[PDB]
């Protein structure tokens, strides 16, 4: 027959923009008195190749994430990029289930971890480009307009899809102290976004279903049917997505 992922069908490539370097401006000479909020963040595009084969649908998302992380291992971390800065992460869960209207946090302190639909999560300055890729159809994310040249979903395009912050359940129980979770185990930042309600990560599935129907990503996208892969088991954003079993 023919494998589900091969170069003839163009289902092994996809372009994505990720953070490349994090360096203080000029000669700051980063010391104790450095804010680290003035770091210069440079982003860049790359074409990510996956091996060929069948690769299911969840295993496809596992390999797509692995391609992003391989780039971070090659150029990313060596130029000051943190694990808190990995922008492109492909997930399958609803990041808004634990949300509470009064606190506007997710009280369970953990995202639901139940597979619903393939998703794209991004950090500011990042994005994915499926213009020359057929992996979008495999993720169940297609253009709402068939004749729309290009299919580039980026961070600026996902208005209203910010992943809510996790409740600091430990502080809450130590009482009430309804506090957002700033970091995780191993002290890598969740990016709490100052408003103390949401994170800097933006989910496509959130902007589609919980965002503005017009002037959002739903306006021109369509939701259709679809420990090396869990390098960050403690991070609730970067954890291996659940499988629809």
Residue numbers in the entry: 7 to 181, 195 to 245, 283 to 301
The authors write:
Adenovirus-derived nanoparticles (ADDomer) comprise 60 copies of adenovirus penton base protein (PBP). In the ADDomer, the PBP monomers spontaneously assembles to form a pentamer, and twelve pentamers organize into a dodecamer characterized by high stability and thermotolerance exceeding 50°C.16–18 The PBP monomer folds into two distinctive domains; the jelly-roll fold domain which is located in the core of the dodecamer and assumed to be responsible for multimerization, and a solvent-facing exterior domain, called the crown domain. The crown domain comprises two highly flexible regions, called variable loop (VL) and arginine-glycine-aspartic acid (RGD) motif-containing loop. To expand the scope of ADDomers for new applications, we engineered ADDobodies, representing PBP crown domain, genetically separated from PBP multimerization domain.
To validate our design by high-resolution structural analysis using X-ray crystallography, we created an ADDobody prototype with minimized loops, called ADDobody-Xtal, based on the assumption that long flexible loops could be detrimental to crystal lattice formation. During X-ray diffraction data collection and structure determination, two different crystal forms were observed: In the absence of zinc ions, ADDobody crystals adopted space group P1 and diffracted to a resolution of 3.17 Å. In the zinc-free ADDobody crystal form, the VL loop could be manually traced through the density in some of the monomers. In the zinc-free ADDobody crystal form, twenty ADDobody monomers are found in the asymmetric unit. Of note, five ADDobody monomers formed a penton in the crystal reminiscent of the ring-like arrangement in pentons formed by the PBP in the ADDomer. Two such penton rings in the zinc-free triclinic crystal form a barrel-like decamer where the VL and RGD loops are outward facing and accessible. The Coulomb potential indicates a complementary patch of negative and positive charges at the ADDobody surface which contribute to penton ring formation in the crystals. Specifically, D106 forms a charge-charge interaction with R83. The stacking of the two penton rings is mostly mediated by van der Waals interactions, with residue F153 playing a central role. A cation-V interaction is formed between F153 and R140 of an adjacent chain, and F16 could also interact with F153 of the neighboring ADDobody polypeptide chain.
